[PDB]
């Protein structure tokens, strides 16, 4: 019921494959955003997969809304023993960003942006 860092890395690979076939992407943007840089203006298919690699964790609902409560029990299926304090920290920083967005997409975009603004250390996003 843990992963170790070596499993962490290699699913955000595993991860993205589920998710990326679905969308018109640029590699540019996914290297970018899997070093947690979310500083550019993201496509619609963009944010779009980040919902899509969200769906597949369990964080959001297909509405996009963020479950706080359930993404905090999902985070050992998650993120290794290394990364669980960073995350439960940006969990609740960023658990109410949704809030501010109507839409699917961008309520789970701007979420996982402000996880990667939050983050006190590195952040990798498949």
Request: charged share 25%.
């Amino acid at each position: 019921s843990h992963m170790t860092m070596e499993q962490f890395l290699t699913s955000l690979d595993m991860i993205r494959s589920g998710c990326a076939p679905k969308f018109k992407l640029k590699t540019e943007d996914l290297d970018r955003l899997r070093v947690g840089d979310f500083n550019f203006p993201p496509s619609q298919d963009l944010m779009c997969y980040t919902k899509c690699v969200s769906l597949m964790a369990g964080t959001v609902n297909k509405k996009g809304e963020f479950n706080a409560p359930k993404a905090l029990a999902q985070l050992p299926h998650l993120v290794p023993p290394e990364m669980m304090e960073m995350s439960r920290k940006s969990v609740e920083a960023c658990r109410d960003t949704h809030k501010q967005f109507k839409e699917s997409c961008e309520r789970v975009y701007q979420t996982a942006k402000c996880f990667s603004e939050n983050a006190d250390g590195q952040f990798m996003w498949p």
